[PDB]
């Protein structure tokens, strides 16, 4: 379960 907002620079 990745958090996509941990780094918004990661697509």
């Amino acid at each position: 379960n990745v958090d996509p907002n941990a780094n918004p620079n990661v697509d």
Epitope: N1, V2, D3, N5, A6, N7, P8, N9, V10, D11
Partner: antibody, heavy 121, light 114 residues
Framework: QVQLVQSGAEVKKPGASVKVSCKAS????????IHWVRQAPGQRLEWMGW????????RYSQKFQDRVTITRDTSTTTAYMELSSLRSEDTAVYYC??????????????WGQGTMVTVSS | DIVMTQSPDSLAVSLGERATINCKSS????????????LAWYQQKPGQPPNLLIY???TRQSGVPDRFSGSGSGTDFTLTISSLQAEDVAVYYC?????????FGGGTKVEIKR
């Protein structure tokens, strides 16, 4: 020509506040999020938070939620981090960085030179 | 918090020899949906800011010499420098961007034996 230039070293008394600046340059400022990372002397990197340079939304580390504020000035292509209620333990180097902009074509990662902040009486 | 633990804290190897650095994460950083490890390796030469070497655990950043390589999966990862050069004096950090807060390892200091 892509770079982040931070403000200079500062000294503060305990209980005061410090505001570090990160002047961006060489890319479209509003496209990427700027992170703030601190490196205490002889220790690992500690992530503090990021701000989206476009819409200005932020996310802070729980370790620093109470007393960190990250802002951005779109007209001057500058990001700011303010740490308040400073303690001597906050003596560290503070970095702004475009951490890991990962796209299919490229990887893009840029750091500012760091700002040393000493908290002392 | 995903805790990142590097091993060893320091190593010394001769010029031209292989240096290996280890990093273990509390939780797995392998995402089942895309089968990618959300892990990077940074190099910090003295007095300079960190510099990105490896991302997705094993992809070299543009301009990184070929002797740097990254491997591992899930919770166990390795950075290898196949033939150490004088300019590789630095502290190396692993980094996870799988969950918030982003976290970094404690760092491994590489010394050159000449």
């Amino acid at each position: 020509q892509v770079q982040l230039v931070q403000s200079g070293a500062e000294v503060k008394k305990p209980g005061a506040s410090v505001k570090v600046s990160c002047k961006a340059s060489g890319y479209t400022f509003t496209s990427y999020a700027i992170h703030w990372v601190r490196q205490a002397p002889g220790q690992r990197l500690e992530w503090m938070g990021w701000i989206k340079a476009g819409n200005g939304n932020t996310r802070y580390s729980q370790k620093f939620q109470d007393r960190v504020t990250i802002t951005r000035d779109t007209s001057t292509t500058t990001a700011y981090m303010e740490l308040s209620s400073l303690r001597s333990e906050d003596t560290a180097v503070y970095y702004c960085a475009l951490l890991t902009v990962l796209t299919p074509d490229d990887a893009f990662d840029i750091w500012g030179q760091g700002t040393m902040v000493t908290v002392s009486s | 918090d995903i805790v990142m633990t590097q091993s060893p804290d320091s190593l010394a190897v001769s010029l031209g020899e292989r240096a290996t650095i280890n990093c273990k994460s509390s939780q797995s950083v392998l995402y089942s949906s895309n089968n990618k490890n959300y892990l990077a390796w940074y190099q910090q030469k003295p007095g300079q800011p960190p510099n990105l070497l490896i991302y997705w655990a094993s992809t070299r950043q543009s301009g990184v010499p070929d002797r740097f390589s990254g491997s591992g999966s899930g919770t166990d990862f390795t950075l290898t420098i196949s033939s150490l050069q004088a300019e590789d004096v630095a502290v190396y950090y692993c980094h996870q961007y799988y969950s918030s807060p982003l976290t970094f390892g404690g760092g491994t200091k590489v010394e050159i034996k000449r």
